Design a protein around this ligand. Structure first.
Ligand SMILES: COc1cccc2onc(N)c12
Length: 126
C-alpha cells in the first residue's frame, strides 16, 4: 500500500563518467521521450495517489524517467548500458503490472518505439 524509498540518483562512492553515448541518452533519448504527449512515467509510481496498493508487491525494480533524468543530469552512470537498462526496466514494469490493452501499456509502447529508434543510432565511443 505504502510507497517505497525512490531509486538511488546520488551515490558519491559509485565511479562516474561523462561520455558521448551518455550525452546522447540525455540530449536525444530522454529529451524525445520526456516531451511526448504520453510521457505517467515522469516520476516514480505513486501507489498511494494512483490507488495501486499491489504495485510494489509486484514491481521489485521500480524505474521512471524522473529518476533517469536525475541520473543523467547528476552524472550517476558509468556507461550507456546502465541507462538503457533503466529505460527497459521502466517499460518492462509497465507491461508486467498492467493488464494487456490498457491505455498505460499503449503509452509505454509509443515511448518504447521512439526509444528503440533513438538507441538504433547510438554514436560510437569517442
Ligand atoms: C498514471 O500512471 C499509472 C497509472 C496506472 C498504472 C500505472 O502503471 N505504471 C504507471 N506509470 C501507471
Amino acid at each position: 500500500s505504502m510507497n517505497p524509498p525512490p531509486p538511488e540518483t546520488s551515490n558519491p562512492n559509485k565511479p562516474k563518467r561523462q561520455t558521448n553515448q551518455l550525452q546522447y541518452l540525455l540530449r536525444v533519448v530522454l529529451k524525445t521521450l520526456w516531451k511526448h504527449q504520453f510521457a505517467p512515467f515522469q516520476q516514480p509510481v505513486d501507489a498511494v495517489k494512483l490507488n495501486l496498493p499491489d504495485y510494489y508487491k509486484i514491481i521489485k525494480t521500480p524505474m521512471d524517467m524522473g529518476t533517469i533524468k536525475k541520473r543523467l543530469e547528476n552524472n550517476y552512470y558509468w556507461n550507456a548500458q546502465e541507462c538503457i537498462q533503466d529505460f527497459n526496466t521502466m517499460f518492462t514494469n509497465c507491461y508486467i503490472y498492467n493488464k494487456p490493452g490498457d491505455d498505460i501499456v499503449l503509452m509505454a509502447e509509443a515511448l518504447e518505439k521512439l526509444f528503440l529508434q533513438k538507441i538504433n543510432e547510438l554514436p560510437t565511443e569517442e
